[PDB]
Design an enzyme around this catalytic site. Structure first.
Site, PDB file in Angstrom:
ATOM      1  N   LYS A 140      31.758  35.063  48.756  1.00  0.00           N
ATOM      2  CA  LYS A 140      33.038  35.000  48.002  1.00  0.00           C
ATOM      3  C   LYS A 140      32.808  34.362  46.627  1.00  0.00           C
ATOM      4  CE  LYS A 140      34.192  31.477  49.900  1.00  0.00           C
ATOM      5  NZ  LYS A 140      33.472  30.480  50.725  1.00  0.00           N
ATOM      6  N   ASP A 167      37.578  28.785  56.053  1.00  0.00           N
ATOM      7  CA  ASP A 167      37.262  28.547  57.458  1.00  0.00           C
ATOM      8  C   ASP A 167      38.467  27.975  58.194  1.00  0.00           C
ATOM      9  OD1 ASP A 167      34.023  27.134  56.444  1.00  0.00           O
ATOM     10  OD2 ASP A 167      34.998  29.052  56.015  1.00  0.00           O
ATOM     11  N   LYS A 193      35.716  33.195  54.889  1.00  0.00           N
ATOM     12  CA  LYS A 193      34.781  32.312  55.566  1.00  0.00           C
ATOM     13  C   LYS A 193      33.610  31.978  54.645  1.00  0.00           C
ATOM     14  CE  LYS A 193      31.587  32.892  59.322  1.00  0.00           C
ATOM     15  NZ  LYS A 193      30.902  33.698  58.277  1.00  0.00           N
ATOM     16  N   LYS A 211      32.002  22.363  48.188  1.00  0.00           N
ATOM     17  CA  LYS A 211      30.739  22.448  47.467  1.00  0.00           C
ATOM     18  C   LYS A 211      30.953  23.189  46.149  1.00  0.00           C
ATOM     19  CE  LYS A 211      28.402  26.467  49.336  1.00  0.00           C
ATOM     20  NZ  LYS A 211      27.823  26.504  47.969  1.00  0.00           N
TER      21      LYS A 211
HETATM   22  N1  LIG Z   1      27.675  41.742  46.468  1.00  0.00           N
HETATM   23  C1  LIG Z   1      26.593  41.118  46.992  1.00  0.00           C
HETATM   24  N2  LIG Z   1      25.447  41.791  47.226  1.00  0.00           N
HETATM   25  C2  LIG Z   1      24.369  41.182  47.747  1.00  0.00           C
HETATM   26  N3  LIG Z   1      24.326  39.878  48.075  1.00  0.00           N
HETATM   27  C3  LIG Z   1      25.405  39.080  47.891  1.00  0.00           C
HETATM   28  C4  LIG Z   1      26.625  39.676  47.328  1.00  0.00           C
HETATM   29  N4  LIG Z   1      27.535  38.688  47.252  1.00  0.00           N
HETATM   30  C5  LIG Z   1      26.950  37.561  47.728  1.00  0.00           C
HETATM   31  N5  LIG Z   1      25.683  37.792  48.108  1.00  0.00           N
HETATM   32  C6  LIG Z   1      24.769  36.770  48.674  1.00  0.00           C
HETATM   33  O1  LIG Z   1      25.457  36.067  49.712  1.00  0.00           O
HETATM   34  C7  LIG Z   1      25.260  34.655  49.600  1.00  0.00           C
HETATM   35  C8  LIG Z   1      26.590  33.913  49.712  1.00  0.00           C
HETATM   36  O2  LIG Z   1      26.922  33.425  48.414  1.00  0.00           O
HETATM   37  P1  LIG Z   1      28.101  32.368  48.114  1.00  0.00           P
HETATM   38  O3  LIG Z   1      29.282  33.094  47.519  1.00  0.00           O
HETATM   39  O4  LIG Z   1      27.480  31.227  47.348  1.00  0.00           O
HETATM   40  O5  LIG Z   1      28.550  31.787  49.547  1.00  0.00           O
HETATM   41  P2  LIG Z   1      30.112  31.562  49.882  1.00  0.00           P
HETATM   42  O6  LIG Z   1      30.661  32.946  50.116  1.00  0.00           O
HETATM   43  O7  LIG Z   1      30.101  30.678  51.105  1.00  0.00           O
HETATM   44  O8  LIG Z   1      30.654  30.884  48.648  1.00  0.00           O
HETATM   45  C9  LIG Z   1      24.596  34.394  48.257  1.00  0.00           C
HETATM   46  O9  LIG Z   1      23.333  33.755  48.454  1.00  0.00           O
HETATM   47  C10 LIG Z   1      24.398  35.750  47.610  1.00  0.00           C
HETATM   48  O10 LIG Z   1      23.036  35.907  47.207  1.00  0.00           O
HETATM   49 MG   LIG Z   2      29.835  29.131  47.440  1.00  0.00          MG
END
Ligand SMILES: Nc1ncnc2c1ncn2[C@@H]1O[C@H](COP(=O)(O)OP(=O)(O)O)[C@@H](O)[C@H]1O
Ligand SMILES: [Mg+2]
Ligand SMILES: Nc1ncnc2c1ncn2[C@@H]1O[C@H](COP(=O)(O)OP(=O)(O)O)[C@@H](O)[C@H]1O
Ligand code: ICS
Ligand code: CLF
Ligand code: SF4
Ligand code: FES
Ligand code: FES
Ligand SMILES: [Fe+3]
Ligand SMILES: [Mg+2]
Lengths: 274, 121, 477, 522, 121, 280
Positions: free
Chosen positions: A14, A128, A9, A40
């Protein structure tokens, strides 16, 4: 030449977990490539350090068509070992949003970017909904190994269930199998053993449990991975541990989908949902 | 030209008479007759108007031109096998899947199937 | 020779183009390797022309009206739309016919709708019906009407098919609507395809339920010979001397009844694969008539094709074929003895739209000449599959060549002769290079058969060894 | 069968006995030809007068027209400017046909490009075609200017040229200062001369509309010359020579005579000569502007009168004696330069030739077709020679032109027989020359078939053709002839009188039958 | 009545004109036109002639009788769903799959699809 | 002249080995013949091409777009003196009709024109276990003029032979398909030569050469060649040639008389294969 995909999700870390994972594998003499299938295009910013990598969909429209597109213009090695591609996606409401993944994956095979020096290929795919070009790795047998990045929150466990349902549908057609679960921690109670409970009922295994840290927040401003910023960080060693178990993971299973009540009953006992 | 529209969203297949070769495309004929093929762009790049076309009179198949824009969109959606691409390039024969906004009506009988979903599932 | 030199030449020629044009045009230039069986990996064809690069290609209307339908003599062909398209194609192609023009033959005439503004705004269907009525009173001996549509016909949304059906039912006349708008297709090839489809859908299947025609085991139909300067008549005399009966001729000196009698015929002899392979495949799939490609350019190809054709019948046809070859041998031996020493060793570059560059290579080689360059404006990849074997190693191959590209290639290669169309003749004559028109035969011919080989040798010697080519430079300069 | 010493082309090779037998067998067996008596009956019917009433009645079918479409004239006009590439926005078949047509007429290279618009542009318009074509042509053939015309496909689509070119410049396809004049040339309006007029007005408006502030009429002491659609190089040459012998400063606007006649010296010149952009820019500074062919220069006349503030004189085409005199008089009045003695001697020589050839010319019947100004000048010259133009045909003439020509024919006793036809094609003229036989035809190569038809009825009904006009395809180098001026008048006189004498010689050549009139001296 | 035959074994879809209501069934129409539907019985009890019928003019659908013999055979090859059996019993509307030797041609436009295999795969 | 033949029988009795050896003998007498493998497992051309399991039409049509795009030369190979070889193949198990490949391949051969005039024999090797489907298509569509059933002393092979004769008589009126004979392949069981003779007499047909077992067949199979080429001087080589001469000289093409299951049981006890059966 093992190709994996990260499914989960949106908002469950991720993209960062894939990038710190990739940075953890680059140091140990491995040349890997990241393919950003999320619409994105923020899935390669920590490697490339770039503000926003130009997507294949973006530069194909400006250059007329995808035939007038060169591989050296879409594939940037910001880190010497790491190769980064951003697929991109269409504008909202204009056709299928996953069709950017189909164009990029087909383009990379056409130009032979999978040749003779890749140890790992990673796909950061929107999880998602699994349809169109997002289900394309599993449907086309592009990614043999699949790792799901989930969380204590119910929607993440529901997302993990849907991906497993799609893996079962294409188990016979393709070698693709669930390789394990990645649990990204928010500061809530009874999480690691909750996802272990999920994995034990899916017939799959937990790989690691990455906790929330503040070292990642410092890295965000740098547009860099935690590994390259502070290799002595507790999170940075945690990512090495997750990386090392990924290489030395051997069991790949056909998942078992979990019903609505059975997933719900797991939440009630742990107290995550009332 | 006789065109039969078919869709699971449609309770009954619809039969229409159309003038062949109009500047208005299959999208014109569909819109004039209330056939709800999803049209989501005006530049022919989204691929949401993907339809499956069957030439019912196989003897009366007309040679046509598959433009580079339609061809590339069909690849991006995935509805273009390599054999159909070679057939269009060498024999100028239409592929099974077409974009309705870019399809010119010919003087034959056609069956047009769509699912109500944009091209690319 | 000099394959690497040819590759470097291609690269330095391609430098003037912008990135898009350079990238696309690189796919269309190749160095010939006769060992290749699949041309498409080596070279690309049948693509749209780059805008503003001075292509030599035509339109679908040229490929349909000007090529396929026009030679049919007892039909009346209407250029539906404005006046220019019919005016520029009037009697510009030498398809020979026997008839009285304006009474029972109408080949060199221009029938048009002559569209005006009100025709564009309101439509020309009623005008089309009125025109059909006017044609029948003015020309009562016409045996059919074809309506070749120009760009505005499809651009304004006229229904010529329904008008054709209504008028044909009313007047008991064959009215064939051809949707050959110029913007359709990238070249004349789609015009060929559309014309073949119209023939199949409105003409070919008319004498299906009748059997009054008395057939013969030796019945053949010439397909894809348009009698340019009388070529089809020489081919016909060569075939009839061999003991066969030619029922149809597509479409030079062709009649509508000959087209309708083509289903009865036992074998199809297809001189041009590009323009009439579609109808040949249709006839093979429908009536079970086999078809084959032959070549009557030069004595070697003519003898080979005659023997191949005779192999499809009994032994009497083969004996007659040997008789014909023996009869015609001394004539072309004398022609070669007279003209080969004058032409030996000369290098020729060619550029004709489909089949003919490959088709005439044997005739040139029969006089000691070698083809350094072969090129097609509209050929598909199967034509290149067929032409790669017939061209020497490390020779230049071009598809949809631009004027700049052809000028640079000719400047670097410096051939002794160039064979192309009217739009390059005066460019290359001002450069001091002999030029032969390979479409119209420079208002000479025919070139098919032995009778045509004599004229071909005479013409090549005439142009190549002409005094005027030493007078090009001023003595003071 | 061929003899290597005497090789025969199609004629007369197909007159051999075996070929005759082959053709007879083919016709008898598989052609289902109508009986020859039926064909002769239908031909004789097509000759008669009831057929002419049916032929005149048709209001839709056009058979053998005598006009082309606008972009041909637009390309011819664009070719007359220095280092300028004609650019036709639309499908490529148009450009191929235009180039073939002009190549066959002039026997010279003709350079023109298209953006090759296809079904893609048929559905979504041709803006990308415009951008890519402009960039490609500028990069490849390196012109100083690109003049844009349109085909019928562009006009039906509704693609607009101004926005497309402005977007091309704004998006970096071509430099913003690169001159790209344009004009809309629909093929369903007018004819090729209308396209010439539209292209010339487009170029003139492109170069002389946004700077009228510093323009003073007569400041450069020159006269602007607008030739119009002209396919005789001798006409450009004679206008230049007549104005140069008179000490008159002039600017010939859109003269293609250099690029249409280039030497063969071992190199190919895509560009040669032409009107310079500086001459176009300085054109409003001229004393006045004269239009050599007023009847197809109307929008240009409106632009020149209403923007350059030039009092354009009311002159006819300088054809014949009287109109050449009037043209020279108007030039003398405008420029303040007297007519020199050389022009007077040339006019006297023309009068001498007229008096020498008058006895043969007197009372000859002529059927003529062509462009409006050319036709009216030819009719005027025929009237001045004592000849009778009995059939006057102009496919692209209007009712005002017909009124003017009828007024011209009214002022002479040699125009009593004459009748004027507009909107009629050459099938109408075939009917006219069958039912009302003239002595000769005057027109382009398309009349060669009409002669053929007449010869089929009999030698006493044959109407020989005289090749003056456009296009001439079956003769060589006739495009170097002069129709304009005293020189053009004497060339036309020589052609006419020698055609009459050649016809008489052919008729009176039979030994012991008609050769009593085969006179050595004529 | 216009019938369009379609099969993977057929290179082109064949269009035929037929007379509606003839005692000779669609099996009759196919055999005159050389359409190779497998016919392996004369009592209508095998499933070999199973075909898929699409009514192209969905408005011009004719009510018919689903004979008890054809109904049982269609069930023996697993080609009659319960919803379509109920629709035939209550609304007298034809099911999607039919037996060609037992199908009466009606006055409409039909698309007939077969695989060359007997009913029951 | 265009003598089309088919070989039927139970799976695993030796149809392919008998067919390829028969065909090898026919080419030795200068006969241009072709083998069409109608068995789903597609191994009836191993010993003629010597390479491997020949690529089937199903595989070639699947990798390409469709059947008409596939080339005649791609599937129809020449081996052992040019005897043409084609394999029908089959669909995926559990999908469609297992005999669908036979229907596809025969249509492709006809459309292309691979049934050229200068062919003397065409042999189809088809699994006879089930008659129905694409395995009955050669009989139903008059593809094979004469049928030879390989049979052994086993109960199943005898039952399968009766089933194939049932198919022929059903389609006897509509076509020229007839029974040519029976080939007895030996398992070395006692009293089987007369058993197959008795069955042929009950069916109303002759019996083609009986083939004793030997280990020389496996010796030539491990090297992927026919027995007749591996040893031309062996007795099995002449025996295969003898079977081929009787095939060419065969002229008794009869409409069989299928027998009842109880008759098969009764005729099995009279030769000692089946123990005598008492209901009590
Ligand atoms: N291992 C981790 N420890 C702490 N914070 C994390 C970790 N992994 C991701 N994050 C935080 O969670 C948020 C989700 O990041 P992102 O990967 O860009 O979103 P998505 O999972 O939708 O791609 C980020 O802003 C990041 O700072
Ligand atoms: Mg991302
Ligand atoms: N004449 C023979 N003598 C001995 N063994 C044989 C003979 N013919 C076949 N076999 C053996 O029988 C086995 C199966 O025969 P095969 O031809 O594959 O049966 P099928 O009829 O199913 O193709 C083979 O492994 C082969 O070794
Ligand atoms: S028809 Fe075709 S361009 Fe096959 S359009 Fe063109 S009289 Fe050429 S190479 Mo002019 S495909 Fe004929 C031809 Fe060849 S007009 Fe003639 S010479 S053999
Ligand atoms: S691509 Fe072909 S030849 Fe071109 S127009 Fe189109 S059908 Fe015709 Fe005729 S009239 Fe003139 S030349 Fe054109 S612009 Fe309108
Ligand atoms: S017909 Fe025979 S081969 Fe086909 S699916 Fe049924 S049982 Fe299997
Ligand atoms: S509507 Fe977008 S591609 Fe057709
Ligand atoms: S053929 Fe048996 S049910 Fe139709
Ligand atoms: Fe010249
Ligand atoms: Mg086997």
């Amino acid at each position: 030449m093992r190709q994996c995909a990260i499914y989960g999700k949106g908002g469950i870390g991720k993209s960062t977990t894939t990038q710190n994972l990739v940075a953890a594998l680059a140091e140990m003499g491995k040349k890997v490539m990241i393919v950003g299938c999320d619409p994105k295009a923020d899935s390669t910013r920590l490697i490339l350090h770039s503000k926003a990598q130009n997507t294949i969909m973006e530069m194909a429209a400006e250059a007329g068509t995808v035939e007038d597109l060169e591989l050296e213009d879409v594939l940037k090695a910001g880190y010497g070992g790491v190769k980064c591609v951003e697929s991109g996606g269409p504008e909202p409401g204009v056709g299928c949003a996953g069709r950017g993944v189909i164009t990029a994956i087909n383009f990379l095979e056409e130009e032979g970017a999978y040749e003779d020096d890749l140890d790992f290929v990673f796909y950061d795919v929107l999880g998602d909904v699994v349809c169109g070009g997002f289900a394309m790795p599993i449907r086309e047998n592009k990614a043999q190994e699949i790792y799901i990045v989930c969380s204590g929150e119910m929607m993440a466990m529901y997302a993990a269930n849907n991906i497993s349902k799609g893996i079962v549908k294409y188990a016979n057609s393709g070698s693709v199998r669930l390789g394990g679960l990645i649990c990204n921690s928010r500061n809530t109670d009874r999480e690691d053993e909750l996802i272990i409970a999920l994995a034990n009922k899916l017939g799959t295994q937990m790989i690691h449990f990455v906790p929330r840290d503040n070292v990642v927040q410092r890295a965000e401003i740098r547009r860099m991975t935690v590994i390259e910023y502070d290799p002595k960080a507790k999170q940075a060693d945690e990512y090495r541990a997750l990386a090392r178990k990924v290489v030395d993971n051997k069991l790949l299973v056909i998942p078992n989908p979990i019903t609505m009540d059975e997933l719900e009953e797991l939440l009630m006992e742990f107290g995550i949902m009332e | 030209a006789t065109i039969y529209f078919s869709s699971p969203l449609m309770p009954h297949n619809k039969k229409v008479q159309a003038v062949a070769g109009k500047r208005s495309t299959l999208l014109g004929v569909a819109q004039e007759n209330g056939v709800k093929i999803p049209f989501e762009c005006q530049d022919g790049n989204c691929g949401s108007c993907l339809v499956k076309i069957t030439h019912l009179d196989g003897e009366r198949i007309k040679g046509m031109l598959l433009t580079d824009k339609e061809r590339n969109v069909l690849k991006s959606v995935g509805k273009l096998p390599k054999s159909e691409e070679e057939r269009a390039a060498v024999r100028d024969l239409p592929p099974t899947y077409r974009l309705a906004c870019q399809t010119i009506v010919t003087d034959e009988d056609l069956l047009v199937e769509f699912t109500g979903e944009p091209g690319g599932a | 020779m000099s394959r690497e030199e040819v590759e470097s030449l291609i690269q330095e020629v391609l430098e003037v183009y912008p990135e898009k044009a350079r990238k696309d045009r690189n796919k269309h230039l190749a160095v010939n390797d006769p060992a290749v069986t699949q041309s498409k990996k080596c070279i690309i064809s049948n693509k749209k022309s780059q805008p503003g690069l001075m292509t030599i290609r035509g339109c679908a209307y040229a490929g349909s009206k000007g090529v396929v339908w026009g030679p049919i003599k007892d039909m009346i062909h209407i250029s539906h739309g404005p006046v220019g398209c019919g005016q520029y194609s009037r009697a510009g192609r030498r398809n020979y016919y026997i008839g009285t023009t304006g009474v029972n033959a109408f080949v060199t005439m221009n029938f048009t709708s002559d569209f005006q503004e009100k025709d564009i705004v309101f439509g020309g269907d009623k005008k089309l019906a009125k025109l059909i009525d006017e044609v029948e009173t003015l020309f009562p001996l016409n045996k059919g009407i074809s309506v070749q549509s120009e760009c505005p016909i499809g651009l304004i949304g006229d229904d010529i098919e329904s008008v054709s059906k209504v008028k044909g039912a009313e007047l008991s006349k064959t009215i064939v609507p051809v949707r050959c708008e110029g913007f359709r297709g990238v070249s004349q090839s789609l015009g060929h395809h559309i014309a073949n489809d119209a023939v199949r859908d409105w003409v070919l299947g008319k004498r299906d339920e009748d059997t009054t025609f008395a057939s013969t085991p030796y019945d053949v139909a010439i397909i894809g010979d348009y009698n340019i300067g009388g070529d089809a008549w020489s081919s016909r005399i060569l075939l009839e001397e061999m003991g066969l009966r030619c029922v149809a001729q597509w479409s030079g000196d062709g009649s509508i009844s000959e087209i309708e009698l083509t289903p009865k015929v036992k074998l199809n002899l297809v001189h041009c694969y590009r323009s009439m392979n579609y109808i040949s495949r249709h006839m093979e799939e429908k009536y079970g008539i086999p078809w084959m490609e032959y070549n009557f350019f030069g004595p070697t190809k003519t003898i080979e094709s005659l023997r191949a054709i005779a192999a499809k019948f009994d032994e009497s046809i083969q004996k007659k074929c040997e008789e014909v070859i023996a009869k015609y041998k001394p004539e072309w031996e004398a022609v070669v003895a007279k003209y080969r020493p004058r032409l030996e060793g000369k290098r020729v570059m060619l550029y004709i739209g489909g089949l003919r560059p490959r088709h005439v290579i044997g005739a040139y080689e029969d006089l000691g000449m070698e083809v350094v360059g072969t090129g097609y404006e509209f050929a598909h990849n199967d034509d290149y599959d067929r032409t790669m074997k017939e061209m020497g190693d490390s020779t230049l191959l071009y598809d949809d060549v631009t004027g700049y590209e052809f000028e640079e290639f000719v400047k670097r290669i410096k051939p002794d002769l160039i064979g192309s169309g009217i739009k390059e003749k005066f460019i290359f004559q001002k450069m001091g290079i002999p030029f032969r028109e390979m479409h119209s035969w420079d208002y000479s011919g025919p070139y098919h058969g032995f009778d045509g080989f004599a004229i071909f040798a005479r013409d090549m010697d005439m142009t190549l060894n002409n005094p005027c080519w030493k007078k090009l430079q001023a003595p003071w300069e | 069968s061929q003899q290597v010493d005497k090789i025969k082309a199609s004629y007369p090779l197909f007159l051999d006995q075996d070929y005759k037998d082959m053709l007879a067998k083919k016709r008898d067996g598989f052609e289902e030809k109508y009986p020859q008596d039926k064909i002769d009956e239908v031909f004789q019917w097509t000759t008669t007068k009831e057929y002419q009433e049916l032929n005149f009645q048709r209001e839709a079918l056009t058979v053998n027209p005598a006009k082309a479409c606008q972009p041909l004239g637009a390309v011819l006009c664009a070719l007359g400017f220095e280092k300028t590439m004609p650019y036709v926005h639309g499908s490529q078949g148009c450009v191929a046909y235009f180039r073939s047509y002009f190549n066959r007429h002039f026997r010279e290279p003709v350079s023109c490009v298209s953006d090759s618009m296809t079904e893609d542009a048929a559905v979504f318009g041709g803006q990308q075609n415009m951008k890519d074509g402009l960039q490609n042509c500028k990069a490849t053939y390196k012109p100083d200017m690109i003049a844009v015309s349109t085909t019928c496909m562009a006009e039906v689509i509704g693609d607009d040229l101004n926005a497309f070119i402005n977007n091309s410049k704004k998006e970096g396809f071509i430099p913003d200062e690169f001159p790209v004049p344009f004009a809309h040339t629909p093929s369903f309006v007018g004819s090729h001369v209308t396209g010439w007029d539209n292209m010339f007005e487009g170029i003139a408006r492109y170069f002389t509309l946004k700077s009228m502030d510093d323009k003073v009429v007569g400041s450069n002491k020159k006269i602007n010359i607008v030739p119009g659609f002209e396919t005789y190089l001798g006409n450009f040459r004679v206008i230049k020579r007549m104005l140069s012998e008179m000490g008159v400063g002039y600017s010939l606007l859109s003269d293609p005579e250099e690029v249409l006649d280039t030497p063969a010296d071992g190199q190919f010149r895509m560009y040669a000569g032409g009107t310079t952009q500086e001459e176009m820019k300085d054109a409003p500074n001229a004393l006045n502007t004269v239009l050599l062919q007023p009847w197809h220069l109307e929008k240009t006349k409106k632009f020149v009168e209403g923007t350059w503030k030039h009092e354009v004189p009311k002159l006819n085409i300088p054809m014949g004696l009287d109109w050449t005199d009037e043209f020279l008089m108007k030039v003398s009045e405008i420029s303040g330069q007297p007519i020199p003695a050389s022009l007077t001697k040339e006019r006297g020589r023309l009068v001498d030739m007229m008096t020498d050839s008058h006895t043969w010319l007197h009372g000859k019947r002529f059927a003529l077709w062509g462009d409006p100004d050319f036709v009216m000048g030819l009719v005027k010259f025929l009237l001045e020679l004592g000849c009778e133009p009995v059939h006057i045909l102009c496919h692209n003439g209007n009712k005002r032109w017909k009124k003017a020509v009828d007024a011209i024919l009214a002022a002479s006793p040699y125009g009593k027989n004459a009748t004027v036809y507009i909107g009629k094609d050459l099938w109408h003229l075939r009917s006219l020359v069958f039912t009302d036989k003239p002595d000769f035809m005057i027109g382009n190569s398309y009349g060669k078939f009409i002669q053929r038809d007449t010869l089929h009825k009999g030698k006493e009904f044959e109407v020989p053709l005289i090749r003056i006009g456009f296009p001439i395809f079956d003769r060589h180098h006739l495009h170097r002839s002069t129709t304009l001026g005293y020189e053009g008048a004497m060339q036309i006189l020589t052609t006419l009188v020698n055609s009459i004498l050649e016809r008489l010689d052919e008729e009176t050549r039979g030994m012991q039958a008609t050769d009593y009139n085969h006179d050595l001296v004529r």
